[PDB]
Design a protein around this ligand. Structure first.
Ligand SMILES: O=c1ccn([C@@H]2O[C@H](COP(=O)(O)OP(=O)(O)O)[C@@H](O)[C@H]2O)c(=O)[nH]1
Ligand SMILES: [Ca+2]
Lengths: 272, 123
């Protein structure tokens, strides 16, 4: 009945994150008995004020998800968050639309519980220090701040890709994310633009507690560099009014509830 | 071959200033243009862009698929995929003189402010 402490006493700090030893979900499930059907966990000791929905954009990346789950579940519990895992699976073969799947995650998670915070994470990024809290702050939160891929440094100060968090209000205020970015790149630069045009800046853990590992992979098919990203990124100010939460359309083809997570398959259409 | 900010700034010294562009602006541009990957190859629309600078085979180099390209730079696009940047730099230099920095579309939107961060903090 007690509010959880500002900082959790279960934090372990830096952790070794490797991807050699193959993972067994069933074992992971076993090691994580407190996680309920659909990837929902809520602290039984204290009351967390962080009602977090972790949203993962997805498509043929099951190996990655296994690892994601194995590492994050223990981590999110140590962070004492009231959370749910949501894998938004893009059905079909058209270009990958990261930002639109995240938008869907937001709408679809709100149907299950009244989450107040939203973490958007790619399947291939694992935090290497549990002090890098997966929650919302007074400002929009960029989490995967120092990825191994960029030599544990932030590639550019305007970077908002990888893992980030927005409270429900912060998200709503920018009309959520854009649905019009198909193919790789720029949607995160757009989101960043959106925040700025709404008077919000970006909060970030320092480079040491934000060390992040990214599971290596080959550039995915159907997610090639968007040739228009640069043009689109320059009109955020105007397009953000007509492209976002208020223009989201999709069809839910299937809601799967596994013990460690909830996976939704959706048809979000094609690059119109 | 995935290079880094500093490697890029070191191999690019000779293009600094040309057409008003600094090495800050170049690292910024190259990062968003190629990710600093000398073997980057991106298909756009009926044309392919090559290397660190993503030089198009539509007008700048001769590619096995576009044997009619004006090949303004007079080079085989494939020579833009190795780790010798001299010819990539020379061609870039032609693109600047003839079309200007806006050939590189990342320039205006990503590289118009906050350049301080793009400097290489190493000798
Ligand atoms: O075919 C695809 C392409 C992308 N993704 C998801 O989209 C994210 C984007 O990865 P990207 O290669 O752009 O990572 P970045 O280089 O921007 O860190 C991945 O992490 C996945 O969660 C996926 O699931 N399937
Ligand atoms: Ca070359």
């Amino acid at each position: 009945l007690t509010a959880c402490p500002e900082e959790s006493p279960l934090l372990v700090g830096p952790m070794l994150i490797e991807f050699n030893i193959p993972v067994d979900l069933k074992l992971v499930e076993q090691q994580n008995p407190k996680v309920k059907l659909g990837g929902r966990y809520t602290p039984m000791d204290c009351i967390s004020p962080h009602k977090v929905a972790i949203i993962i954009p997805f498509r043929n990346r099951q190996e990655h998800l296994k690892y994601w789950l194995y590492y994050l579940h223990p981590i999110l519990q140590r962070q004492q968050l009231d959370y749910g895992i949501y894998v938004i699976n893009q059905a079909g073969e058209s270009m990958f639309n990261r930002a639109k799947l995240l938008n869907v995650g937001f709408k679809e998670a709100l149907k299950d519980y009244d989450y107040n915070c939203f973490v958007f994470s790619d399947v291939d990024l694992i935090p290497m220090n549990d002090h890098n809290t997966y929650r919302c702050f007074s400002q929009p939160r960029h989490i995967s701040v120092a990825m191994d891929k960029f030599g544990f440094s932030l590639p550019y100060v305007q970077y908002f890709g990888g893992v980030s968090a927005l409270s429900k209000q912060q998200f709503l205020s920018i009309n959520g994310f854009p649905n019009n970015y198909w193919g790789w790149g720029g949607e995160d630069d757009d989101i960043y633009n959106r925040l700025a045009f709404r008077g919000m800046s970006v909060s970030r853990p320092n480079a040491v507690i934000g060390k992040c590992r990214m599971i290596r992979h080959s550039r995915d098919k159907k997610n090639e560099p968007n040739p228009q990203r640069f043009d689109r990124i320059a009109h955020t100010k105007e397009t953000m009014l007509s492209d976002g939460l208020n223009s989201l359309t999709y069809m839910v083809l299937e809601v799967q509830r596994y013990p460690l997570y909830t996976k939704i398959t959706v048809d979000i259409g094609t690059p119109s | 071959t995935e290079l880094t900010k500093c490697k890029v700034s070191h191999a690019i010294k000779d293009i600094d200033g040309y057409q008003g562009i600094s090495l800050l602006e170049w690292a910024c541009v190259l990062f968003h243009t190629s990710g600093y990957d000398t073997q980057a190859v991106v298909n756009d629309n009926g044309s392919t862009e090559y290397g660190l600078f993503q030089i198009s085979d539509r007008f700048w180099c001769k590619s096995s698929e576009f044997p009619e390209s004006e090949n303004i730079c007079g080079i085989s696009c494939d020579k833009l995929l190795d780790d010798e940047l001299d010819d990539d730099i020379a061609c870039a230099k032609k693109i600047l003189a003839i079309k200007g920095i806006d050939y590189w579309k990342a320039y205006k939107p990503m590289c118009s402010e906050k350049l301080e961060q793009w400097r290489c903090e190493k000798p």
